[PDB]
Scaffold this active site. Structure first.
Site, PDB file in Angstrom:
ATOM      1  N   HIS A 577      36.939  36.738  34.078  1.00 15.70           N
ATOM      2  CA  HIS A 577      37.157  35.973  35.324  1.00 15.70           C
ATOM      3  C   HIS A 577      36.973  34.438  35.176  1.00 15.70           C
ATOM      4  CE1 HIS A 577      38.464  39.338  37.752  1.00 15.70           C
ATOM      5  NE2 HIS A 577      38.480  38.554  38.845  1.00 15.70           N
ATOM      6  N   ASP A 620      39.790  42.386  33.583  1.00 14.41           N
ATOM      7  CA  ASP A 620      38.584  41.664  33.145  1.00 14.41           C
ATOM      8  C   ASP A 620      37.814  42.232  31.936  1.00 14.41           C
ATOM      9  OD1 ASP A 620      36.637  39.408  34.377  1.00 14.41           O
ATOM     10  OD2 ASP A 620      35.370  41.108  33.858  1.00 14.41           O
ATOM     11  N   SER A 715      27.801  37.655  33.396  1.00  9.51           N
ATOM     12  CA  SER A 715      29.067  38.318  33.195  1.00  9.51           C
ATOM     13  C   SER A 715      29.244  38.843  31.777  1.00  9.51           C
ATOM     14  CB  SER A 715      30.158  37.278  33.398  1.00  9.51           C
ATOM     15  OG  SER A 715      29.872  36.499  34.536  1.00  9.51           O
ATOM     16  N   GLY A 716      30.042  39.871  31.529  1.00 12.37           N
ATOM     17  CA  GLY A 716      30.462  40.233  30.180  1.00 12.37           C
ATOM     18  C   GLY A 716      29.398  40.795  29.236  1.00 12.37           C
TER      19      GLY A 716
END
Length: 765
Positions: A577, A620, A715-716
């Site tokens: 994202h 994503d 994130s991630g």
């Protein structure tokens, strides 16, 4: 069926009158080892399941005082919980609390009211206990009690009548048999890997009672519900014949001040706020959310008012509106409440990283749970919360023998233990104490067999010395448990040990030490870790790299907004994202090891993911696979296999590793953390709150009382499975931006949906 009389909420045993002790290792074996003796139909039973030792108690909470631990279980067969009969009598074991006319605890063996009909010994297996209600004499009437008042007995008030498809008394009796819906459609299996890749088979938290597809309504909807087979209808209202009774009586009431507060007899209503409130003749003509006809006869003394739920006082209405949650505040000797119950974690790492030289051997067996240590210091006085922080206190379980300063057996794992007041060890001993391994079994593709006893164990398929019906290796086959080879089904943080060739004792370790896999293993703290309770947003702490499993996902210049996860010498999972918009060439960026934003240092892996990526559908789930192989180092750890066909655990906490912003100090810099559980299967997809605004095949996290998801930078990261005793993987942590948005988490990204490239490209790079 051998299963259909078990329902329990667990953690109890008793200081019983007489006691008995045996052994077993499987659940169907019960049907050939427990019921076969005449000695009683067990009014309590106590099968300590992990090490085949089994116990039973001749008397229970209906006749004797209680004890509690983790894994200690006052099993109470539904016969002794049978608040009912139907027809001429069959299993009734009532205990009725309070009738219309005020009966409570007085006994069968009292010669009053009339010449003694029964006493506890007058049959060997129908339980003629104290006051407690039975169908003994072939007298077909069923619910009745013997009493201080002769007047009459058999009539249809305290004769309860369980129409079992919906609510009676507390509404907990939801063990219905029907499954059908308002639409006339039909409802999904929980019993295979198709039509949907998941199941609710009985080895998960028991109070859900999720048998196959019958009506479960735990939070009490106005009409029943669950998941249609049709993925277009997906889930909907269940539909059934009508309801009426409800057979109420004087019912439940509290004996000390845990109670609702309904009994407010007071001749006043005073507070500091005002003057007077509502005699509901004042309803002319503004109607009120409570009025006297819904409290039909309950001491409304003209109108000194009376409690409508919450706590010990009235809080009703006045012709003024200053604060309706104002309770009355009358000064009197009313009550003394305190906070309550549950759980057992916050455990120490017992100084193993180069083990402090105050422990011996592998602890091969000690007559119950214990394989335990002897690092040995001072004990906890169990009438105080002392000393260093841990999640619960002795006053959470008070009636468990926990009077005086009694040293008492806490929560099973060590054997008989006490909270040890010292930084070198937080628990020890109760104060009146009388082809080899991948490491954790999960998919251990190997065939060593050693004990510290040396030679091979028994095969778990065999019936000598140990035996089972259900738990055959073939019944749990996904990577093989065949023959007399080693398998720890715990995959214990304490290392590989097995239900050995040695009969009827805890385990044995290998002859063999753990072969090294650190910084490439699934996600282990190898120096066994510090821990703290969480449940504060953003982060209370930013520890020096005890979260080492870190990749940072970054702008074309290398400013920080996301994170990521190595999963092989070249394979990776990250969010996308900031990507997730146009199929460009090499320049959006990734760093492998920065626990921080701009403030990198040169030991971090800083070869960019030149070869960016995104799926054949843009999602994503970016495998930001390394161009080169990695430059792995101890404060920069990969996860591994991002597999489909595994399933996450439930109601317990997941975690995220969090490169988000600070909130409450310096404005930018460092990674923080969040621990966050599974949300109930009736929140996102529902009529009231949202009506279906998000694509539920992505995986969430969220509390019963607020948190985050992966924020910015969080994130991630490795989407850590808290399964097989140390971290592994299901999907990738998705996106992140916007700190602290109260009780509104967001995406994490599943692998199975796009597997042909998501698990596809990552083959042998």
């Amino acid at each position: 069926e051998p299963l259909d009389d078990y329902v329990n909420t667990q953690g109890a045993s008793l200081f019983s009158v007489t006691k008995k002790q045996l052994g077993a290792g499987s659940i169907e074996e019960c049907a050939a080892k427990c019921e076969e003796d005449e000695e009683f139909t067990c009014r309590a039973f106590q099968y300590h399941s992990k090490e085949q030792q089994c116990v039973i108690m001749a008397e229970n909470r209906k006749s004797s005082i209680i004890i509690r631990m983790r894994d200690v279980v006052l099993f109470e067969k539904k016969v002794y919980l049978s608040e009912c009969k139907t027809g001429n009598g069959k299993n009734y074991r009532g205990t009725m609390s309070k009738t219309k006319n005020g009966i409570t605890c007085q006994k069968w063996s009292s010669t009053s009211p009339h010449r003694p009909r029964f006493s506890p010994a007058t049959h060997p297996s129908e339980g003629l206990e104290e006051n407690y209600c039975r169908n003994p004499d072939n007298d077909p009437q069923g619910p009745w009690c013997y009493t201080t008042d002769p007047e009459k007995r058999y009539d249809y008030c305290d004769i309860l009548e369980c129409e079992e498809e919906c609510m009676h008394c507390s509404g907990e009796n939801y063990d219905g048999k029907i499954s059908k819906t308002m639409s006339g459609l039909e409802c999904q299996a929980w019993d295979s890997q198709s039509p949907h890749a998941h199941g609710y088979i009985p080895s998960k938290f028991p109070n859900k009672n999720l048998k196959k597809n019958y009506c479960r309504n735990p939070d009490r909807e106005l009409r029943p519900w669950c998941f249609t087979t049709d993925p277009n209808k997906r889930w909907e209202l269940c539909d059934i014949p009508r309801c009426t009774t409800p057979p109420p009586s004087s019912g439940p009431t509290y004996q000390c001040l845990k109670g609702t507060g309904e009994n407010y007899r007071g001749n006043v209503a005073v507070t500091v706020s005002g003057h007077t409130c509502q005699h509901w003749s004042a309803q002319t003509p503004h109607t009120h959310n409570r009025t006297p006809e819904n409290f039909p006869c309950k001491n409304l003394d003209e109108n000194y008012c009376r409690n409508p739920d919450g706590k010990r006082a009235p809080w009703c209405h006045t012709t003024n509106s200053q604060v309706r949650w104002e309770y009355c505040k009358i000064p009197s000797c009313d009550s003394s409440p305190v906070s309550t119950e549950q759980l057992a974690p916050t455990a120490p790492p017992e100084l193993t990283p180069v083990v402090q030289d105050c422990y011996h051997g592998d602890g091969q067996s000690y007559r119950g749970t214990s394989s335990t240590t002897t690092t040995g210091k001072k004990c906890q006085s169990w009438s105080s919360m002392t000393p260093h922080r841990h999640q619960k206190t002795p006053e959470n379980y008070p009636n468990a023998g926990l009077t005086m300063n009694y040293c008492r057996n806490p929560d099973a794992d060590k054997g008989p233990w006490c909270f040890t007041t010292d930084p070198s060890v937080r628990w020890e001993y109760c104060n009146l104490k009388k082809d080899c391994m991948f490491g954790n079994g999960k998919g251990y593709r190997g065939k060593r067999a050693t004990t510290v006893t040396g030679t091979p164990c028994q095969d778990w398929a065999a019936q000598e010395p140990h035996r089972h019906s259900i738990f055959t290796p073939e019944t749990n086959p996904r990577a093989g448990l065949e023959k007399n080879y080693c398998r720890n089904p715990d995959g214990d943080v304490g290392g590989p040990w097995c239900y050995t060739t040695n009969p009827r004792k805890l385990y044995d370790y290998c002859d063999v030490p753990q072969c090294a896999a650190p910084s490439f293993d699934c996600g282990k703290p190898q120096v066994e870790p510090k821990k703290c309770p969480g449940r504060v947003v953003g982060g209370c702490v930013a520890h020096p790299h005890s979260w080492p499993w870190q990749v940072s996902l970054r702008t074309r210049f290398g400013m920080h907004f996301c994170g990521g996860t190595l999963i092989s010498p070249e394979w990776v999972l990250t969010a996308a994202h900031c990507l997730e918009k146009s199929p460009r060439p090499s320049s959006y960026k990734v760093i492998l090891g920065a626990h921080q934003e701009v403030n990198l240092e040169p030991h971090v892996q800083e070869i960019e993911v030149s070869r960016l990526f995104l799926e054949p559908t843009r999602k994503d789930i970016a495998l930001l696979k390394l161009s080169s192989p990695a430059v792995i180092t101890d404060k920069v750890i990969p996860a591994c296999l991002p597999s489909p066909n595994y399933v996450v655990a439930d109601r317990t906490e997941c975690f995220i590793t969090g490169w988000g912003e600070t909130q409450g100090t310096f404005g930018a810099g460092l990674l923080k953390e969040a621990q966050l559980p599974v949300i109930e299967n009736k929140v996102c997809n529902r009529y009231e709150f949202l009506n279906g605004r998000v694509q539920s095949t992505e995986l969430c996290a969220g509390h019963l009382a607020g948190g985050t998801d992966s924020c910015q930078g969080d994130s991630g990261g490795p989407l850590v499975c808290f399964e097989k005793d140390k971290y592994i993987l299901q999907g990738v942590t998705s996106w992140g931006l916007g700190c602290a948005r109260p009780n509104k988490p967001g995406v994490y990204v599943r692998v199975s949906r796009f597997v042909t490239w998501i698990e596809g490209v990552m083959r042998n790079n």
